[PDB]
Amino acid sequence: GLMQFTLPVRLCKEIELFHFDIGPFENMWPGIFVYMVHRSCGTSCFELEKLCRFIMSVKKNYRRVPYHNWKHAVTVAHCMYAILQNNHTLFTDLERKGLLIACLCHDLDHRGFSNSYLQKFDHPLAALYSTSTMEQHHFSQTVSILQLEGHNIFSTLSSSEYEQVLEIIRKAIIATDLALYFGNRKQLEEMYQTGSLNLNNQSHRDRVIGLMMTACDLCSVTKLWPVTKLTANDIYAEFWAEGDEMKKLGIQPIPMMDRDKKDEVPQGQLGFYNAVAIPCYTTLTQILPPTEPLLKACRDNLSQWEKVIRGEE
Numbered sequence: 531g532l533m534q535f536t537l538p539v540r541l542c543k544e545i546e547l548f549h550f551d552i553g554p555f556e557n558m559w560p561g562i563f564v565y566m567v568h569r570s571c572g573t574s575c576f577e578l579e580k581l582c583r584f585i586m587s588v589k590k591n592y593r594r595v596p597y598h599n600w601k602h603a604v605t606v607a608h609c610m611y612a613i614l615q616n617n618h619t620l621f622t623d624l625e626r627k628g629l630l631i632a633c634l635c636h637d638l639d640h641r642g643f644s645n646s647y648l649q650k651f652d653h654p655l656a657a658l659y660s661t662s663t664m665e666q667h668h669f670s671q672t673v674s675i676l677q678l679e680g681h682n683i684f685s686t687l688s689s690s691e692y693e694q695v696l697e698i699i700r701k702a703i704i705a706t707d708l709a710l711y712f713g714n715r716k717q718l719e720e721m722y723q724t725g726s727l728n729l730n731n732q733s734h735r736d737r738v739i740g741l742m743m744t745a746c747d748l749c750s751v752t753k754l755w756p757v758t759k760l761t762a763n764d765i766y767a768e769f770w771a772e773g774d775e776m777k778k779l780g781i782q783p784i785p786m787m788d789r790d791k792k793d794e795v796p797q798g799q800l801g802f803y804n805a806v807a808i809p810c811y812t813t814l815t816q817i818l819p820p821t822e823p824l825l826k827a828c829r830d831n832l833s834q835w836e837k838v839i840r841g842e843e
């Protein structure tokens with residue numbers, strides 16, 4: 531009750547910044563997450579015993595893949611923490627509770643393969659969930675863990691509040707399907723520009739939270755250049771394994787997943803920053819002005835990938 535989580539001075543200061551790296555010490559990541567819930571939500575949002583037990587079951591259900599692992603989960607939650615803290619008054623008590631949990635859970639039991647590979651492999655999950663295959667699985671795994679004995683961190687919520695928070699978590703996790711991001715951001719762009727965007731419209735909040743989820747999920751592009759560059763190695767280690775698996779099924783993979791096209795990585799990053807990252811943090815800064823450091827940091831890393839192409843590294 532009177533038990534605050536504190537972090538060492540350097541972490542206590544740097545964790546407030548968008549570009550914070552959670553570091554290589556796995557055993558501190560739960561403490562980091564709790565610290566963020568307490569400062570973002572309150573020391574009263576969750577029974578500590580239940581929260582800790584939930585965090586550790588979530589961790590257990592992330593796999594040892596190069597990118598879509600437990601570190602990704604806590605990184606994506608830290609980004610969401612930075613957004614919520616720099617936009618204090620714009621979000622309900624239920625959204626603050628729900629979104630940090632949604633981010634921790636958003637890639638639960640990921641196998642390091644895209645929805646496309648599941649569908650071409652004919653994985654059982656692809657028959658159970660025809661679109662956003664993995665993302666419906668991730669939400670499904672969230673509900674599973676919430677229903678384990680001693681794991682209901684939402685037990686104090688009313689029947690209807692409980693249903694509202696599970697519906698926030700569901701939409702938030704479905705929105706991490708990048709196939710959905712393009713349309714979602716186009717609509718938000720138009721709505722902001724015609725001045726029709728209304729944060730009292732529940733379907734408008736949904737879209738805005740959806741863009742935040744893309745923002746947090748892509749936040750590897752908003753870090754210091756050495757974090758960004760080294761994370762890219764993990765990302766491509768997954769994609770190239772998937773490319774290998776595509777070739778095993780007798781399918782030429784897309785270039786992004788072909789390890790034979792290593793040399794084109796710098797150009798592929800450019801495309802991605804221009805087609806996805808920049809547009810994402812642009813629209814997000816327009817709708818939420820205090821998230822501008824994500825756009826600024828994204829542009830800095832784009833400039834770093836241009837430097838790689840020019841042979842300056």
Ligand SMILES: Cc1nc2ccccc2nc1CCc1nc(N2CCCC2)nn1C
Nearest residue numbers: 748750751765785786791794795798799802
């Ligand atoms: C999908 C994706 N998500 C990321 C999320 C966060 C940080 C970096 C990310 N990088 C990518 C990969 C971008 C990409 N690479 C290539 N290649 C085509 C030939 C060689 C490389 N094409 N594209 C689109």
Ligand SMILES: [Mg+2]
Nearest residue numbers: 636637664706
């Ligand atoms: Mg995902």
Ligand SMILES: [Zn+2]
Nearest residue numbers: 636637706747
């Ligand atoms: Zn993710």
